[PDB]
Design a protein around this ligand. Structure first.
Ligand SMILES: *[C@@H]1O[C@H](CO)[C@@H](O)[C@H](O)[C@H]1NC(C)=O
Ligand SMILES: *[C@@H]1O[C@H](CO)[C@@H](O)[C@H](O)[C@H]1NC(C)=O
Ligand SMILES: *[C@@H]1O[C@H](CO)[C@@H](O)[C@H](O)[C@H]1NC(C)=O
Lengths: 198, 151, 188
């Protein structure tokens, strides 16, 4: 009698877990939706009778697996549950890190800022969730399309013996070598060098 | 087996556990707590076992804790409003812990944990695992997750 | 009869201060009906006592402490303090920075003197870097204890720069300390 939500997905980036869905075709009136999460006891409600096409599930434990379901409701009748399973540590997207770049003669100092988890704190970032975090840097001379890779040991690195007065663009991403999982790349930051070699 | 991630738990999870311990302490004072032949805390430290035996001791303490607090959330639904998210997490850790595992001090410890629910009152066990809750999470789990670095 | 009874934490340790020979005891939260005397502060003449690394202590719960004034003529009543949950109320100490310089990189590594009975606390520090008398300092990203902060150095000139750092302890909620005494040196 009532159509279920369509294309039910979990958009999770840096443990900001947004259950998105598309409203099905309905001609009687404006639909509403109710999303639930399976807590340890029973399906608890998160969004009740909202008019939005999304619900926030960032409050989930982010340890272990969670079961999420949503249905569409009109008046007293309601649709069937569309149920997905979400594992935050494995299904969340690792966002781009920050990158502060400084020019020093033929060298190029770049510091990497961790991707931040909104519902946590400065002392617990994406770098602290995964035990084998390592940054992954990629650079090239602007206009050459010849990428070079470097894996820094920590959150700082120096690119030495570069060409003088040449613009280089740099990117950084998270990476997990235990699973070979890569995070998203940072936006390319391009900076020009100066002169002389030490 | 990869429990090394549990050296540093997410602070929001610890805030959820802290609300649980504060909620359990309010219920334990009105119940008949403090029974004879106490088990927590254990007199010896986990560093006094071999690295491969430490998860075995931690598993038996965590399984008891999970078994007791699950029975506590089913006894008091109002108290289970706070215990729900902790229970989910303790279960997941226990699952990850059992993946690292195939008459000394470990035999007698595993024995007393196994012969305690059948010979102790519920409010006592509830109080016993409540005060041991952050001993398990902050010290014992940390030691086991640190592998050969805990010494 | 000691009046002010305060059980406070300063620099990773728990101390008990009292204001008017003294006797001091402590009670654990699970062992609510049991007190235990301090051997180090037994008959002491000071106004503070170290409540850290005790014989049967349990820093993983809250504990109170009581103190009474004694004399060869009379005994005063006990005056108990408030509870202090160590894992949630411990105050950290500013680190000691070990400064080394290589080429154009300055590494500022934090070091700690920690009590032996301390739980495995998660310590991170934030390094402050600035020229002597600048007003505007440079805060670097939160860095784990055991990893240095590497700082880009300009090779020219020889300006007097100072370095400071503060500890951030994070269990359930981050707890910040003050900044250390700024270590000033000759940049080059
Ligand atoms: C604690 O001592 C201070 C001065 O040292 C005093 O001002 C305060 O009233 C005292 N607190 C009491 C008596 O509760
Ligand atoms: C903190 O206390 C420890 C002993 O517990 C001591 O070694 C250290 O110097 C103290 N740090 C201070 C007072 O800044
Ligand atoms: C820095 O100090 C810490 C103290 O905990 C030590 O572990 C480490 O080896 C020192 N050196 C570096 C490069 O981190």
């Amino acid at each position: 009698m009532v159509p279920p939500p369509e294309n039910v997905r979990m958009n999770s980036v840096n443990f900001k877990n947004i259950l998105q869905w598309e409203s099905p075709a309905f001609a009687k009136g404006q639909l509403t939706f109710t999303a639930q999460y399976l807590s340890y006891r029973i399906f608890q409600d998160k969004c009740m009778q909202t008019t939005l096409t999304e619900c926030d599930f960032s409050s989930l434990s982010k340890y272990g697996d969670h079961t999420l379901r949503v249905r569409a409701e009109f008046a007293d009748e309601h649709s069937d549950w569309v149920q997905i399973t979400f594992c935050p540590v494995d299904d969340t997207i690792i966002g781009p890190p920050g990158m502060q770049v400084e020019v020093l003669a033929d060298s190029l100092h770049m510091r990497f800022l961790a991707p931040k988890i909104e519902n946590e704190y400065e002392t617990w970032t994406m770098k602290n969730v995964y035990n084998s975090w390592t940054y992954n840097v990629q650079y090239w001379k602007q206009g050459t399309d010849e990428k070079f890779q470097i894996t820094p040991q920590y959150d700082f690195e120096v690119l030495r013996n570069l060409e003088p007065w040449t613009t280089y663009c740099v990117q950084v991403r998270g990476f997990l070598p235990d699973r070979n999982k890569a995070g998203e790349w940072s936006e390319p930051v391009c900076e020009q060098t100066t002169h002389d070699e030490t | 087996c990869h429990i090394a991630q549990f050296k540093s738990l997410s602070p929001r999870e610890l805030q959820a556990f802290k609300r649980a311990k504060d909620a359990l302490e309010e219920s334990l004072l009105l119940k008949d707590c403090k029974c004879r032949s106490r088990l927590f805390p254990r007199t010896w430290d986990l560093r006094q076992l071999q690295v491969r035996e430490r998860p075995v001791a931690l598993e038996a303490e965590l399984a008891l804790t999970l078994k007791v607090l699950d029975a506590t959330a089913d006894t008091d639904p109002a108290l289970g409003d706070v215990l729900d998210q902790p229970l989910h997490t303790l279960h997941h850790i226990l699952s990850q812990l059992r993946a690292c595992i195939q008459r000394g001090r470990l035999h007698r410890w595993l024995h007393r944990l196994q012969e305690a629910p059948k010979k102790e009152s519920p409010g006592c066990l509830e109080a016993s695992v409540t005060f041991n809750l952050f001993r398990l999470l902050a010290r014992d789990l940390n030691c086991v997750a640190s592998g050969d670095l805990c010494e | 009869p000691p009046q002010n009874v305060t059980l406070l934490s300063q620099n990773f340790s728990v101390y008990l201060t009292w204001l008017p020979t003294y006797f001091v005891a402590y009670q654990s939260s699970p062992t609510r009906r049991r007190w235990r005397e301090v051997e180090e502060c037994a008959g002491t003449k000071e106004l503070l006592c170290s409540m850290m690394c005790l014989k049967k202590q349990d820093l993983y719960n809250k504990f109170k402490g009581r103190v009474r004034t004694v004399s060869p003529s009379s005994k005063s009543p006990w005056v108990e303090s408030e509870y202090l949950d160590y894992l949630f109320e411990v105050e950290p100490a500013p680190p000691v920075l070990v400064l080394t310089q290589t080429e154009e990189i300055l590494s500022a590594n934090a070091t700690y003197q920690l009590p032996p009975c301390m739980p495995p606390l998660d310590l991170k520090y934030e390094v402050a870097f600035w020229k002597e008398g600048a007003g505007n300092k440079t805060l670097f990203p939160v860095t784990p204890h055991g990893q240095p902060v590497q700082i880009t150095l300009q090779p020219a000139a020889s300006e007097h720069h100072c370095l400071s750092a503060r500890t951030i302890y994070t269990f359930s909620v981050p707890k910040y300390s003050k900044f250390s005494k700024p270590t000033c040196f000759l940049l080059e």
